[PDB]
Amino acid sequence: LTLTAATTRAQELRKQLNQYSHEYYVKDQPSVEDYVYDRLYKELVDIETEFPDLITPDSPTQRVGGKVLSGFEKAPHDIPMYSLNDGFSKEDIFAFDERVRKAIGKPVAYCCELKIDGLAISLRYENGVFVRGATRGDGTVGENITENLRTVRSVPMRLTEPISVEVRGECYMPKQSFVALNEEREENGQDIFANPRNAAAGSLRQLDTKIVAKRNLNTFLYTVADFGPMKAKTQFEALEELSAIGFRTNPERQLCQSIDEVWAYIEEYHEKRSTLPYEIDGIVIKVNEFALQDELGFTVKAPRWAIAYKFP
């Protein structure tokens, strides 16, 4: 195979393999059998092995990692990553709704989402290319964990549309992976992680990306730092749009027109809790209309337009 032929073929393979990866990791619904992906993946590895200059950032072979950092550079969030206000009872939730109606002056719809137990992350894309991955940190300054996030399979290295946007969401470790990891640590005389949240946080703190690539971390994106590039006008629309551009979103969301529907949602997933492949510590209730979120604003700690109902 000539360099000229390999150059063209490599792009074809990346394109095809990344589409399969999108279906498998982002949609959780593969179209082809694994052996189909494996054969094409092997073909690409052979090409890259022969002509290493053909290796690119969006090549699926880079998911295994390789870089080892000495430490993490600071990662500023010019648009702050606020925290969430907490609610602990049906009372707190209805009180929240009352305060929201009092401020807005009319009934308001809420986009309800599961509160994934993990770590909040921020992903920056420029012209569709993944350029920065960061932890929330203290809200205004986090850690630059770009290299580690390159190994997180559900994180796209190149979006289909060449858009420049910074999306945010949760990075977590599914229950099964958490269990297996702790067994592995027990086998190697290491301290186990107390919970999936800690396992995810500890994994993203590792400096050797090759180790992180093996931690089986996953994601659920739920917001955008700057809605400039995007068209969504409500949170529910934002979730659909995040999915449209290539990110993994949680399918269990629900738009509720009343606080009673909100409470019904909470009860529904409070029972379905144990059945999910990931842990959740509550429900996040968000004023759906962005125009109303803007009107409500933020306290110093968090937005006034959202509240997290924490499971007892």
Ligand X SMILES: CC(C)(C)c1nc(NCCc2c[nH]cn2)c2cc(C(N)=O)c(N)nc2n1
Catalytic residue IDs:
115
- The residues that touch ligand NMN, with contacts defined as CB under 6 A, are 20-21, 23-24, 30, 32, 34, 37-38, 41, 60, 63, 153
- Interatomic CA distance for residues 93 and 309, integer angstroms: 7
The answer to the question of whether 38 is labelled as a binding residue is: yes
Beta bridge partners of 284: 113, 308
Closest distance of CB 232 from ligand X, Å: 13
Contact pattern for ligand X over residues 44 through 73, marking x by CB under 6 A: ------------------------------
Q: Which is nearer to ligand X, 138 or 260 (CB)?
A: 138
Q: Which is nearer to ligand X, 67 or 132 (CB)?
A: 132
Rg (CA), the chain: 21
The answer to the question of whether 63 is labelled as a binding residue is: no
100, exposed or middle or buried, with CB in 10 Å at 0-12, 13-18, 19+? buried
Q: Which letter does DSSP use for residue 188 in this model?
A: T
Structure-token match 């300054």, residue found: 141
User: Which residues, numbered 72-131, are part of the site for ligand X (CB under 6 A)?
Assistant: 81-84, 113, 115-116, 120
- Residue 161, contacted partner among ligand X, ligand NMN, none, CB below 5-8 A by kind: none
Q: Are 265 and 283 in contact (CB under 8 A)?
A: yes
Q: Are 149 and 118 in contact (CB under 8 A)?
A: no
The answer to the question of whether 83 is labelled as a binding residue is: yes
Closest distance of CB 231 from ligand X, Å: 18
Q: Is residue 286 close enough to count as binding ligand X by CB under 6 A?
A: yes
Give the angle subtended at the CA of 153 by the CAs of 150 and 156, to the nearest 5°.
Answer: 65
- Residue 93, contacted partner among ligand NMN, ligand X, none, CB below 5-8 A by kind: none
Q: How far apart are the first and last CA of the chain?
A: 62
